[PDB]
Point group: C2
Chain length 68, copies 2
């Protein structure tokens, strides 16, 4: 089981907030507070394939992410 951590979004916050909402169903205020609060464990206990797909989706939106 793996964890996906949002390490930083920097200048790509708009894009990253959009990607985090699509991946999690969080409301706008909530996703915005999580991205603005990085580092943050966004998803914990996901399978290897789920973690690698979320990692890639956040990387394409412009975030610095870690899978542990």
């Amino acid at each position: 089981e793996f964890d996906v951590i949002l390490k930083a979004a920097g200048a790509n916050k708009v894009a990253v907030i959009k990607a985090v909402r699509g991946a999690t169903g969080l409301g706008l205020k909530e996703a915005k507070d999580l991205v603005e609060s990085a580092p943050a464990a966004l998803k914990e206990g996901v399978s290897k394939d789920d973690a690698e797909a979320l990692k890639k989706a956040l990387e394409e939106a412009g975030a610095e992410v870690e899978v542990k």
Copy 2:
């Protein structure tokens, strides 16, 4: 499609944070910041059955929740 909103957790925050992590996979810091930030849209675009099950799970943990 429905939204599940955490309106307040009051004195039941510990329990509610646990329930929100089980339902979403959020890390501890993140779930704690969301519960402490209520009102918050926890899940948006879920089916009717998913919304009613999450509502019940948060109500049993001790939160004031709304389904819209």
